């Protein structure tokens with residue numbers, strides 16, 4: 562609903578996690594999106610497993626990287642729509658390797674039926690996010706190692722390299738901004754979050770936005 566929406570303030574977002582040394586950003590973005598969409602569909606907020614994707618999704622490349630849209634499709638097409646709880650399939654890729662996939666000994670925490678890819682337009686992405694909840698997006702994270710807090714008003718925007726989760730925006734602030742959940746622990750940014758200026762494709766935020774559909 563226009564002016565400002567922060568889904569963290571509506572019990573919809575889980576705590577900030579840590580990908581460690583694994584290039585598993587794609588999995589953190591995809592699962593963060595699924596956790597928020599599951600809650601918004603009328604289910605308790607449950608922590609879900611990134612490790613399921615890193616180890617079992619063979620259409621992506623584990624710790625070498627992947628794509629959120631491929632991850633969503635693997636869940637539906639190969640894993641019978643199941644997303645395991647984080648407690649039953651804990652993160653094990655912190656050192657930079659993906660252990661072999663185990664197909665049993667886990668509990669289903671959520672299911673999805675598909676995914677939608679959103680327009681490459683920030684006004685349109687805010688409109689969808691405002692009603693339907695957090696969006697999985699890709700950014701150029703090149704300058705993000707120097708981010709110490711505040712609204713980043715200028716961002717290197719050359720090549721997408723990092724998937725993250727858009728959880729809100731605020732258009733009534735002095736400079737309109739987006740609020741993004743990252744996976745580099747609470748010690749980075751504003752307790753694991755970053756705010757970037759909205760309306761000028763900062764960090765190429767509008768280019769690869771999508772969301773899972775639970776129905």
Ligand SMILES: *[C@@H](C(=O)O)[C@H](O)C(=O)N[C@H](CCc1ccccc1)C(=O)NCCC(C)C
Pocket residue numbers: 580583584585586587621622625626627628629630698699721722723724769
């Ligand atoms: C992100 C990170 O851990 O910070 C990963 O390194 C990662 O997933 N990188 C991707 C590039 C390498 C790659 C692409 C496609 C298939 C295999 C490897 C990357 O661009 N991630 C962003 C994903 C968005 C664009 C969907």
